[PDB]
Amino acid sequence: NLCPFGEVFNATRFASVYAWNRKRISNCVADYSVLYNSASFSTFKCYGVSPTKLNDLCFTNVYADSFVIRGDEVRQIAPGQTGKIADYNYKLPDDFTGCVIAWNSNNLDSKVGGNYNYLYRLFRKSNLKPFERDISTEIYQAGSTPCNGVEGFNCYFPLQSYGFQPTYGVGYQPYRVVVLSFELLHAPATVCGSNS
Amino acid sequence: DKEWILQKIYEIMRRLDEEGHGEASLRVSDLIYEFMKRD
Ligand SMILES: *[C@@H]1O[C@H](CO)[C@@H](O)[C@H](O)[C@H]1NC(C)=O
């Protein structure tokens, strides 16, 4: 009963970072070292223990959060970070226990003339709580005048598009990101590594 | 004030988009983030 990590990592369409996806994984066995070696990742940073140590551990649930950002923004997918993505799009707690995995997807998510399917939130009145998800599209009041739900002077649609183009520099090219959270409740641990 | 410059910066970002300067737009978007974080 293998954990369906292929459905997350090998998914055809990833989500925009502001509307990040979450898959709950449970009641299965997963070889985390095989996941580490199944592709060439540019980031595979674990904050609890290593892939090899995960293979002896069991967890109640594993949550796989996936999305696309710029390569220069992957740094913000880490505890204690601030920035446009960490403040307004996807926030990790200071006490984070899990792995952040990322790889270049210029070959899939870039497009001649610009792929506008991937969005990010540019404006927000306050920073996100950890794992909070904000999919609203209220017009942002950036100035002193009320906006009344209409775009205008200092009244902005809160989302912008990445517009990925294969000729972007590496730092601006799209990277698919998968964040694994390892949840241990006072409950049966049914997600186990291949050597538990 | 601060309102006038933020609007022109927003407009440049939107125009760089339609003129296909996608990377240049994203670099301005970064500035809009840093600017509005200041008092
Ligand atoms: C993605 O697909 C390739 C080829 O089908 C496979 O070798 C790889 O293990 C898959 N990735 C995961 C995480 O299952």
Numbering used by the authors:
A (entry chain B): 334 to 529
B (entry chain A): 1 to 39
Manuscript excerpt for this entry:
The spike protein of the SARS-CoV-2 binds to human angiotensin-converting enzyme 2 (ACE2) through the receptor-binding domain (RBD) and changes the conformation to fuse the viral and cell membranes, mediating viral entry. Here, we used a structure-guided strategy to engineer an inhibitor peptide with mutation-tolerant and potent binding ability against all SARS-CoV-2 variants. We named the peptide CeSPIACE (COVID-19 eliminative Short-Peptide Inhibiting ACE2 binding). For engineering, we determined approximately 2 Å-resolution crystal structures of CeSPIACE or its intermediate-stage peptides complexed with the RBDs of several strains, including WT, Alpha, Delta, BA.2, BA.5, or XBB.1.5.
The high-resolution structures identified the roles of the peptide residues and provided information on which residues to modify and how to modify them. The binding surface composing of G22 and L26 contributed to binding to both tyrosine and asparagine, whereas the previous A22 and M26 reduced the binding ability to Y501. CeSPIACE exhibited high affinity to all mutant RBDs, but the kinetics differed depending on the mutant, with the binding rate being fastest for the Omicron-type RBD and the dissociation rate being slowest for the Alpha-type RBD. Y501 binds more tightly on G22 and L26 than N501, which contributes to the nondissociation properties of the Alpha strain.
